[PDB]
């Protein structure tokens, strides 16, 4: 049993969302210290874990420890109901049911029922957010897969096509690029949509964490309030 | 034979908009005080009456009283080419056509052709359209159908679905509740898709008087301009 | 060989997304003075010319002049990917390939394959962008066609459709008329569909200057950063 108090509903229903893009059911982990959820899309290419401290909550009581699983398209819906100055309630009692409240100018509460990377990376780079949606986009018109090249201070993204080609290089002097950290000159290839729901609702100003490796899988890590972890693992592109 | 002249088209769009939704033909009554119509949707659930007094136009000229029918998705579409700071001019005169002018950085007039509730309620509730509206949009997601319940200074909506469900409370300690007088529990059901087109345009701080009995129609009214009265009559659902 | 620099990726992209609606390729002049483009649409109904003086770019290096060929609906997806701040650069070298740099926060280079009047006019008007505008969608509500009528101080275009019917007038005494040179009535018409796409990214404030004649064509220019050209030659309808 649990009740969990989120500031700012819309906020939350950005976070579903971006989970329902690569994900349709997950589990959540509801603890003393936080919630927490991993799971992989259909096509078990990318990883999804998430880490949600009890410090973003402005109540977070938890009785007992418990694991609850839902459908996130169906969890999505209800979110998208509440404001950007909305309080959520996140309910949990003995039966298999979510209580799910916006609290706005009036008291609206939802009945859900419940439903039951150790790699040797050669490359980390940090980025700002809006540079990689830029990138991603890009490459959408040109191919169905984006190539990641890291060199010492020297991050590239490219992404060629039938007769087109695209190319985004970033040093150090660059905005874009807050830190690069590379042992040997590192290259691979990821599907570009992929990328593109993993950038969803990506902010701008937002650091992101980026390593991999010579065609091995990417992972990707940006926090949601500062405290709230997201973080991808993506395979490489065959 | 008239001329009326209403600043703001946008609004009145929205006003033609909204009726345009359960209605698709009606006649206008204009009369030395103001327009009025009456008219029920093609389920004959849905009971409208307008009232539009010549307080709301900066201009009401009415030289000889006249009823006059007009197709309202016809209606809409040239009043959508209004945008908010125009002002509309409605002129009649002998043949069977309907003039209206757009007057804003242009005048643009348009000739279109003219074609040819004692209830005993026992509960009245007095809340805030962006309550009404969200509460709406909440049971849509669940059912097809809302429960209206009202009690001694105690007002809920519900709807319940296949596996979910949803809930909303008022009292009057809430904003959203603005007065209630219930002579005795009352309970029924309406349908939701009908709701959702009424509550279409409502504004979020207008007031909305609701008046219903047991298992009986509903009286739904709030004011357009303060002084236009847009009446809804809604049969309960079998 | 040259090296164009324009500030403000968006509006380029605007003016390029513009000509796509009636030109599907086209064969780009770069001159030292500037940029040129001159084509009809598919059904030879329209003539484009399109004149870019050097004066609207930031940086403009032209080595030695020459023609390309590109295609416009793949040109407009990429530079639809820049900002309002964003810098476009424009370098062509050796190759049949045109290069494109959108630089922002980060800089983003896109290689793209390239591929291989005197009419006597009886009345000239000048009219601002809006009013032009909203009349072409006002009348494509009523009909296809448009009719434009211009007499000694007096501007009219009007649409007959089915059973409606659209007027709008103007006089020296309006807002929206700036200039009117007559020679003798004048009066035409042509298609609301090629006007539409034509009044497509026109400005409100802008001047719109319309020259025809009698059952013959129309002539429409206005200017692009205030020095740009964008003229249009529209064959009356049959």
Chains 1, 2, 3 share one sequence.
Do not use: C, W
Request: a negative charge; charged letters at 30%; zero cysteines.
């Amino acid at each position: 049993p649990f009740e969990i108090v989120f500031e700012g509903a819309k906020e939350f229903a950005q976070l579903i969302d971006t989970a329902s893009k690569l994900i349709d059911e997950a589990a959540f982990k509801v603890t003393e210290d936080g919630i927490s959820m991993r799971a992989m899309d259909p096509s078990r290419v990318v990883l999804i874990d998430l880490n949600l401290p009890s410090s973003i909550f402005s109540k977070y009581e938890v009785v007992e420890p418990e694991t609850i699983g839902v459908n996130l398209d169906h969890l999505k819906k209800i979110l998208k109901r509440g404001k950007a100055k909305d309080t959520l309630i996140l309910k949990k009692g003995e039966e298999n049911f979510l209580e799910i409240t916006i609290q706005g100018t009036a008291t609206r509460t939802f009945r859900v029922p419940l439903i039951d990377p150790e790699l040797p990376f050669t490359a980390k780079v940090v980025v700002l957010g809006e540079v990689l949606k830029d990138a991603v986009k890009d490459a959408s018109l040109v191919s169905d897969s984006i190539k990641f090249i890291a060199r010492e201070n020297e991050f590239i993204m490219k992404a060629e096509g039938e007769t087109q080609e695209v190319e985004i290089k970033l040093t150090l002097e660059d905005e874009g690029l807050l830190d690069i950290e590379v042992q040997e000159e590192t290259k691979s290839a990821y599907g570009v949509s992929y990328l593109s729901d993993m950038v969803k609702g990506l902010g701008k100003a937002d650091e992101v964490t980026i390593k991999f490796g010579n065609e091995m899988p990417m992972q990707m890590e940006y926090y949601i309030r500062d405290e709230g972890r997201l973080t991808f693992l993506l395979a490489p592109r065959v």
